Design a protein around this ligand. Structure first.
Ligand SMILES: Cc1cc2nc3c(=O)[nH]c(=O)nc-3n(C[C@H](O)[C@H](O)[C@H](O)COP(=O)(O)OP(=O)(O)OC[C@H]3O[C@@H](n4cnc5c(N)ncnc54)[C@H](O)[C@@H]3O)c2cc1C
Ligand SMILES: NC(=O)c1ccc[n+]([C@@H]2O[C@H](COP(=O)([O-])OP(=O)(O)OC[C@@H]3O[C@@H](n4cnc5c(N)ncnc54)[C@H](OP(=O)(O)O)[C@@H]3O)[C@@H](O)[C@H]2O)c1
Length: 455
């Protein structure tokens, strides 16, 4: 009876577990999670207006309800239980704990009230307990987001959607309340490079262009000569660039021109600008602008980089969201960690020089794929692990699994959240959603969550 444990209950943990249970009829999989609840970024990252994307929870739930899978929330691996303890109890351990850090801007002014990582702002409207008191000040009229990735688009879309259109989503009631009072009418999404280097994808770009109550602000000068350079581009890329190009250069029909003229909000893309400094209000109590270094591109293809021209531009704004990526964080002394790539060093999921220890998802590859990328990547890890298990490369003999770990946790005063505990809070969140017409109303207070969890 093979005992495997998974550290992290987001898409990598669940798809790794799912692959292991499907391809090995005896193996048992225990999934550990630091938060009180499961699902990682499916619950706390994916936007409330992308409910479609969260449907993978239904298959995670079937896996968690099966006889050979168990969930242990409220357990911080590296703190409540060490990786070495897990290695001693299981035949194999998979690190699937994501990239829990935001990359900082590393610029002056970054400490002013009104500056946040997009991550934190997302965690706030998605009910991540640690961001429940973020209390972003939306009394300003312009927000600036740095980074032109899908995350940037999510934050801009939430800031500009007519609040009534988010009423029936699972957005927190607190964030929706704040959004109803927001004075933000303009959002600029600023990239260091040009149009050809944007990192967002077409579904999200179209959602922005078509967002009711808004008009797009693209400078055609940013796109001169684009059709020409995208003629040998890959189909998806080319389609995206053509959608951007049209939005920037086609004069709209009479109806769309009217709709754009009556719009109360606007969003735009700014290119060739890198963040140099957040500017304070005269009294230093808030952000009042962002100083951007003008840049120009040098290099060919993917090797192209922005290099400063020496010119600067100041752009007034009261909200600055850095949406420039992530880094995983080390978890425990027994786990190698590369501070540079911000990943656990590994060879196709096998952690370097640590027999029995594997990894999957963002902590394995770096923070850049969508859920399906994470899924097929977790499957690759799952294949190598199971081939190692079958081959007899992991310790021979019994391995106690949770029997041993719970006894440690029992003594240490740590009471894990089982999946059935979670099911109780899920029912409560869902029922609370019934009265208000939402999918659920997430509990944010850890104390109240613990009570509703049966703790
Ligand atoms: C804002 C945002 C929006 C996104 N939107 C989409 C989208 O619309 N569509 C899409 O396909 N993809 C989207 N993605 C991509 C998707 O979030 C990632 O592909 C996926 O979540 C990565 O999976 P993961 O399991 O590696 O990491 P995560 O989902 O982060 O999960 C890691 C898990 O490990 C837990 N953990 C961390 N430390 C510990 C510890 N010490 N002990 C135990 N457990 C621990 C974390 O709490 C978490 O639950 C988005 C990402 C972000 C940031
Ligand atoms: N629906 C979906 O499919 C979906 C939805 C949401 C999120 N996601 C995913 O989640 C993953 C991570 O997302 P992400 O948006 O945070 O990052 P990302 O996709 O990698 O893009 C963000 C980056 O910020 C920029 N950047 C980095 N450092 C910078 C700096 N110091 N100053 C200015 N700009 C800087 C990079 O610009 P440069 O390119 O020029 O260097 C790039 O735009 C992605 O794979 C994204 O697709 C997917």
């Amino acid at each position: 009876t093979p005992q495997i444990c998974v550290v992290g209950s987001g898409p990598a943990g669940f798809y790794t577990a799912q692959h292991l249970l499907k391809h090995h009829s005896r193996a048992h999989v225990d999934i550990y999670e630091k938060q009180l609840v499961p699902f990682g970024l499916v619950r706390f990252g994916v936007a409330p207006d992308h409910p479609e994307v969260k449907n993978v929870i239904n298959t995670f739930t079937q896996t968690a309800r099966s006889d050979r899978c168990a969930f242990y929330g409220n357990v911080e691996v590296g703190r409540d239980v060490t990786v070495q303890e897990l290695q001693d109890a299981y035949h194999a351990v998979v690190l699937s704990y994501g990239a829990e850090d935001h990359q900082a801007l590393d610029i002056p002014g970054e400490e002013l009230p009104g500056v946040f990582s997009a991550r934190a702002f997302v965690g706030w409207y998605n009910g991540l307990p640690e961001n429940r008191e973020l209390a972003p000040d939306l009394s300003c009229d312009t927000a600036v987001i740095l980074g032109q990735g899908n995350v940037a688009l999510d934050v801009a879309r939430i800031l500009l959607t007519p609040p009534d259109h988010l009423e029936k989503t699972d957005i927190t009631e607190a964030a929706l309340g704040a959004l109803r009072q927001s004075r933000v009418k303009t959002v600029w999404i600023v990239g260091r490079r040009g149009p050809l280097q944007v990192a967002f994808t077409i579904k999200e770009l179209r959602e922005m262009i078509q967002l009711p109550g808004t008009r797009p602000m693209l400078d055609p000068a940013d796109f001169l000569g684009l059709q020409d350079r995208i003629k040998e581009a890959a189909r998806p890329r080319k389609r995206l660039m053509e959608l951007l190009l049209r939005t920037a250069t086609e004069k709209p029909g009479v109806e769309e021109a009217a709709r754009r003229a009556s719009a109360s909000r606007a969003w735009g893309l700014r290119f060739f600008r890198s963040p140099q400094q957040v500017l304070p209000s005269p009294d230093g109590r808030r952000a009042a602008g962002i100083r951007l270094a003008v840049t120009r591109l040098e290099g060919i293809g993917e090797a192209t980089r922005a290099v400063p021209t020496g010119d600067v531009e100041d752009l007034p704004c009261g909200l600055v969201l850095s949406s420039i990526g992530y880094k995983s964080r080390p978890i425990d002394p027994s786990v190698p960690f590369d501070p540079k790539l911000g990943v656990v060093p590994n060879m196709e999921g096998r952690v370097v020089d640590v027999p029995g220890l594997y990894c999957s998802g963002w902590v394995k590859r770096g923070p850049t794929g969508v859920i399906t990328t994470t899924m097929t990547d977790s499957f690759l890890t799952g294949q190598i692990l199971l081939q190692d298990l079958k081959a007899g490369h992991l310790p021979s003999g019994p391995r106690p699994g949770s029997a041993f770990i719970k006894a440690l946790l029992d003594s240490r005063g740590v009471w894990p959240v089982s999946f059935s505990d979670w099911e109780k809070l899920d029912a409560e969140e869902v029922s609370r959603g019934q009265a208000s017409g939402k999918p659920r109303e997430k509990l944010l207070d850890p104390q109240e969550m613990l009570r509703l969890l049966g703790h």
